[PDB]
Design a protein around this ligand. Structure first.
Ligand SMILES: *C(=O)[C@H](C1=C(N)C[C@@H](C(=O)O)C1)C(F)(F)F
Ligand SMILES: Cc1ncc(COP(=O)(O)O)c(C=O)c1O
Ligand SMILES: Cc1ncc(COP(=O)(O)O)c(C=O)c1O
Lengths: 404, 404
């Protein structure tokens, strides 16, 4: 017969690096909001592959886009033109209202690209002396695992044993406009990179007016505002971009994860000509960036978000979800936070009760969620979920919580 | 009607970043060794998407693996297990005879992973003081476009304007064993990372015995030998790994590009337990790394290379290609170099005549190649090419080169 779940666990333990400690579930099929493991059990997916499958698993429109293109052409490299890339470029730039896009594959590649743009613009436009340019980041940030990305992290698990670290990266507290203003007094700062909601830190939502104040300070001091929307973008928080809640237009927007509906690693860096064109031909690239197969699925993934009005659904259903989670007792859950369908709860963890235990029992009751800290659980189902599916999930959550 | 080639160029110029200056040809289909542009013209592909379509464009076996899996499950994220990853991990580790593999998406992510492994092993096993670890690179190296990767580059187009740079990277000449021996006197060196053939630098082939000498010096001084085979591996030079020509075993091997046959960004870091397990759960990863869709594609891509004996074909046909190119007059072609089907010619560049114009005319005569410097042209067709097709291509190259 086929492998069991324990077969799958031990094969990976023997032949794969040990860089992850996954929840013990061996999944074999996904469709829409549901996942199935190899034993045939069905689960509500309340992680959405860290918001990569906003459109649900294996969305038919995106799948058909991939199957149509894979028989024609999948990779020319950027040494030549292909017929798909410019169609995607015109589409995504008009959708988010920026001049240009630079295509990359993974989220951390988008962030590295943004750092390279900020520095090159800092030297060639702002007039910073080489190589004194600084980029400011917020404590709690997460944007990947390259040496550069971990050099801006305040989490020791990310950076311990991996130094020495990239110079020119400064860290300030999140949700702290006076701290930002102080940092931007230095004219060698080229950019501030920030998540409009910090996902990895525990769905940390900054105070109203924070994004508007970041925009005001960056513009005043001639500093690029880089908004990392790789997790928060693409309807997850109830808008095309989380910055849309305060009408804020960043200088550079990063997109990734759900840009492909989970079918292909596609990321994007959006900005206007005066920034984008500081990088000349030959000065930045990627083998697979902008390939025609990824472009076709990104177009379809974006079309799904717009056609099915998933931002409106995430906003309306997130209100219901937060409202129902807030009914849970306050000797069990200490806080409920989030926007749209990016939410989290904080449990009152004791010496013998934590969030990993809760998620194990949620899995036993047919709902998959992952804990982000010893006391925080994220709830992020695909945006295609309907109200009755959500209420059935809320039921599983309520029953699981108080069954402790 | 459909966009013309000029339409396609103009649209990318308007909506896409200008980080590339591609050869002006607009492809819409490819299969095997051939590409078709939107006007319907047919071309020999002598770039193979930088050796990512070693198996030829749209290889039916790889396409079938992608189409079969895209219906089932494409991305769970590493928070859970999927049933495919461990089958791939077992397959690739047994094929290359290393204990373990760490899956990533792009080549530069694999190189970043190797640098992190080297540093972590350097501090936790070798005993180097934090954070004094060094990694030595060879001048001319290329391993991607992150801030860390360009920090080791000697090509100003890669790094100029993008600093300040990552510390702890040292540079020595390529193909220079005395220089490596002198560099490895520093006990703080954790690793030497090197390409068995430098592709981006213009297909620079080191002297016989270089790789053996590298392995000897790295072992003698307790330094990790990291072999970057993202371009040279996977039958391109006539072996599973280019280091097989000298039968040496690196401590870490990097694979990328053709690991998917061009259908998906998949890369891999191979090494034994003593190195791999220095990275603990939660200390490294990637959203799309190890997803089931990429794994299914990679298994099929590797099976194609094995089943069709593409290494043997590249070895046999590459010597024919080089011998025929060497018959051109020295007034025109000053050097021919390569291994297997990774080859280049050096032309006698004048002020009126350069590699770009040769490649423009090659395109006019039905063959696509790209210059890597003003006087170097790479010739690297897919490894499924047949001898008669190669000889037809050689006639095109002869006619084009001698037509000036
Ligand atoms: C691949 O072997 C190599 C290239 C990269 N690496 C990135 C790609 C690009 O710049 O788009 C080209 C080379 F050396 F060109 F072949
Ligand atoms: C906000 C944010 N930025 C960047 C990344 C990196 O994405 P990836 O894992 O594809 O490199 C992620 C994860 C993310 O959540
Ligand atoms: C030898 C080598 N290493 C690493 C890379 C980076 O690969 P990618 O473009 O997928 O990031 C390339 C390109 C390469 O040729």
């Amino acid at each position: 017969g086929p492998p069991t779940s324990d077969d799958i666990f031990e094969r990976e333990y023997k032949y794969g690096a040990h860089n992850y400690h996954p929840l013990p579930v061996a999944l074999e099929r996904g469709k829409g909001i549901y996942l199935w493991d190899v034993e045939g059990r069905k689960y509500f997916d309340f992680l959405s592959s860290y918001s990569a499958v906003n459109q649900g698993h294996c969305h038919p429109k995106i799948v058909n886009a991939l199957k149509s293109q894979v028989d024609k052409l999948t990779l020319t490299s950027r040494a030549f033109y292909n017929n798909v890339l410019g169609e995607y470029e015109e589409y995504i730039t008009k959708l988010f209202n920026y001049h240009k896009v630079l295509p990359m594959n993974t989220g951390v590649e988008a962030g590295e690209t943004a750092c390279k743009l900020a520095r090159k613009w800092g030297y060639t436009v702002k007039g910073i002396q080489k190589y004194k340019a600084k980029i400011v980041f917020a404590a709690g940030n997460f944007w990947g695992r390259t040496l550069s990305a971990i050099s801006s992290s305040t989490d020791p698990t990310s950076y311990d044993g991996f130094g020495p670290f990239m110079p020119g990266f400064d860290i300030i507290p999140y949700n702290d406009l006076p701290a930002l203003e102080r940092a931007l007094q230095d004219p060698n700062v080229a950019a501030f990179m920030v998540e409009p909601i910090q996902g990895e830190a525990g769905v940390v939502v900054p105070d109203p007016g924070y994004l508007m104040g970041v925009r005001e300070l960056c513009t005043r001091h001639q500093v690029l505002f880089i908004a990392d929307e790789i997790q928060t973008g693409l309807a997850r928080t109830g808008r095309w971009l989380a910055v849309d809640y305060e009408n804020v237009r960043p200088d550079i927007v990063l997109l990734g994860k759900a840009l492909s509906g989970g079918l292909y690693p596609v990321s994007a860096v959006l900005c206007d000509d005066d920034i984008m064109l500081t990088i000349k031909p030959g000065e930045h690239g990627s083998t697979y960036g902008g390939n025609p197969l990824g472009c076709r699925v990104a177009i379809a993934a974006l079309e799904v978000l717009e056609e099915e009005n998933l931002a409106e659904n995430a906003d309306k259903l997130g209100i219901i979800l937060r409202n129902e989670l807030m009914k849970l007792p306050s000797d069990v859950v200490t806080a409920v936070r989030g926007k749209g369908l990016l939410n989290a709860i904080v449990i009152k963890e004791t010496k013998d009760w934590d969030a990993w235990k809760v998620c194990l029992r949620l899995r036993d009751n047919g709902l998959l969620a992952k804990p982000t800290h010893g006391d925080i659980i994220r709830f992020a189902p695909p945006l295609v979920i309907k109200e009755d599916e959500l209420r059935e999930s809320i039921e599983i959550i309520n029953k699981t919580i108080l069954s402790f």
